[model samples]
Target: SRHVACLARSERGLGFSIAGGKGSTPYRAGDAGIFVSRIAEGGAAHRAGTLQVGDRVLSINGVDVTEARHDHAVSLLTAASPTIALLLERE
Candidate 1:
């Protein structure tokens, strides 16, 4: 029911990108979740084989992010870490 991906940052970076991509700041969604619009070519997320375009983030490391705002979700994703565990749900 969920897709889990443990992403890591290389020397370059996390190697993936997130966006609602409607040219809107503080992007809004029909659902209260973040959408991964794209994945960097050959990046950690790509290599993980878990994340995918149109996938919705359900939680991070057991912390539910369903109600988290855009900035809040970004903060959680950008936190310093060698690896991050994400729970993604594909609607």
Candidate 2:
């Protein structure tokens, strides 16, 4: 399944954490991909209620991050201000 979530950044930032990706530690076998590892309580993403932990992040803004390194994805997310458009996937 797939979902598109446009999340606005709050003072607390995107209010979520990401895990997995190429060359990164996997939570489980075959879990090596960008994923919404956690969502902070009362945060922007949490309030949106469209994103969830374990959701795979296929892209950020309009750039594909499916095969990007963890740091690269972090840079993209951090640089995306105000709001971000995320293309996500889930099993």
Candidate 3:
């Protein structure tokens, strides 16, 4: 399944952590992609109430990063600060 999440960053940050990527565990096989690994309680992602652990992130701010490396994906997300639009897939 797929969905979109629009999140406004809090003072602390986006309040979410990501894992997996081009060569990560979550990407070891087909349809590999970046995944949400954590979400800080009461933080931006948590407050948005739509993000969850294990959700595959297909894109950020309209930029497709499903095939990006871990650090590259992180950078994209970081640069998208203040506000971000995420395209996600949940299995």
C-alpha TM-score for every candidate: 0.80, 0.90, 0.85
Q: RMSD (Cα, Å) of candidate 3?
A: 2.2
How many pairs of residues in model 2 come into backbone collision? Answer: 0
Model 2 C-alpha lDDT per residue in residues 1-91, reported as the tens digit of each score:
9899988787766788898877678645776689988889899888998888988999998999888888888888889488889999973
Q: What TM-score does model 2 achieve against the real structure?
A: 0.90
Per-model root-mean-square deviation over C-alphas: 3.3, 1.5, 2.2
Query: Could you tell me the lDDT of residue 61 within candidate 3?
Result: 86
lDDT of 1: 0.71
Q: Provide backbone clash counts, one per model.
A: 0, 0, 0
Alpha-carbon lDDT, every model: 0.71, 0.85, 0.82
Model 1 TM-score? 0.80
Model 3 over residues 1-91: C-alpha lDDT tens digits? 9999998876777788998877566633565678888888989889888898988899988888877888888888878467889999873
Ranking the candidates on TM-score from highest down gives: 2, 3, 1
Best by lDDT: 2
Model 1, residue 30: what's the lDDT? 56
Candidate 1 vs candidate 3, TM-score winner = 3
Clash pairs, model 1 backbone:
none
**What are the per-residue Cα lDDT tens digits for candidate 1 across 1-91?**
6877887778677766565422334334454457776788788888878888778777877777776666667777788878888888773
